[PDB]
């Protein structure tokens, strides 16, 4: 089973990916880093309600993180 993620990067480009629901939140973070947005400088947000995913334990599953079955995730430079 797979989670569908609509990623919005800070230049406004979009990417739709899938990840296994059972995969670590860390897999998402690493994916965003391979796209040129490293964890040390960028964080992950959802809207409605606003949740800061980069405050979570990354060893948590995508399902536990609340990103299944689909979620829009914003990539944003840290303050």
């Amino acid at each position: 089973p797979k989670a569908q993620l609509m990623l919005r990067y800070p230049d406004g480009k979009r990417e739709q990916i899938t990840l296994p629901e059972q995969a670590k939140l860390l897999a998402l973070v690493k994916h965003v880093q391979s796209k040129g947005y490293p964890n040390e400088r960028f964080e992950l947000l959802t809207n409605f309600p606003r949740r800061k995913l980069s405050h979570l334990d990354y060893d948590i599953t995508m399902q536990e993180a609340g990103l299944c079955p689909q979620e829009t995730v914003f990539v944003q430079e840290r303050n």
Binding site: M6, F48, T72
Partner: protein, 170 residues
């Protein structure tokens, strides 16, 4: 006409959000947080975020007063909705406060109203929109007089927000 829908009142009101039943969202292949383009009367359009609502009848769409006004529609009127995935991050938007909502207003409109309003919420906004922001001593309305790209965009953290000079009417 699966994407023409009856306007219904909002629950959990927000200027950037409209709600559909999950089946109608499947029917139209809309996902959570997708941007969508809405068409109302007098060639008025609006761009919003769509969320699912187990409370909403299939053939209806929930939207608040701000969005209904921007579409010139009333409860019970019909609008159309379509996917709108290519809306860009804004370089810059220009907004101006409505004169009769800031008559006594002292203070910085950007710091008290606009900055928290737009903060990290990725609001879609369109030229001509009027929106109501709470805060301060009383709520203020602003009109979008220009966006770049035109005529709509997403107000991102890097989107420059200009709040010019004299308030305007209508």
């Amino acid at each position: 006409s699966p994407n023409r829908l009856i306007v219904d009142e909002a629950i959990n009101e927000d200027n950037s959000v409209v709600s559909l039943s999950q089946p109608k969202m499947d029917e139209l292949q809309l996902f959570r947080g997708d941007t969508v383009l809405l068409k109302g009367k007098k060639r008025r359009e609006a761009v919003c975020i769509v969320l699912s609502d187990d409370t909403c009848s299939d053939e209806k769409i929930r939207m608040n007063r701000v969005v209904r006004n921007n579409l010139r529609v009333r409860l019970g009127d019909v609008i159309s909705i379509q996917p709108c995935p290519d809306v860009k991050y804004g370089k810059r938007i220009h907004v101006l406060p409505i004169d009769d909502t800031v008559e006594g207003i002292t203070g910085n409109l950007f710091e008290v109203y606009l900055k928290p309003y737009f903060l990290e919420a990725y609001r879609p906004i369109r030229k001509g929109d009027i929106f109501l922001v709470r805060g301060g001593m009383r709520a203020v309305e602003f009109k979008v007089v220009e966006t770049d790209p035109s005529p709509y965009c997403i107000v991102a953290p890097d989107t420059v927000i200009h709040c010019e000079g004299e308030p305007i009417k209508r």
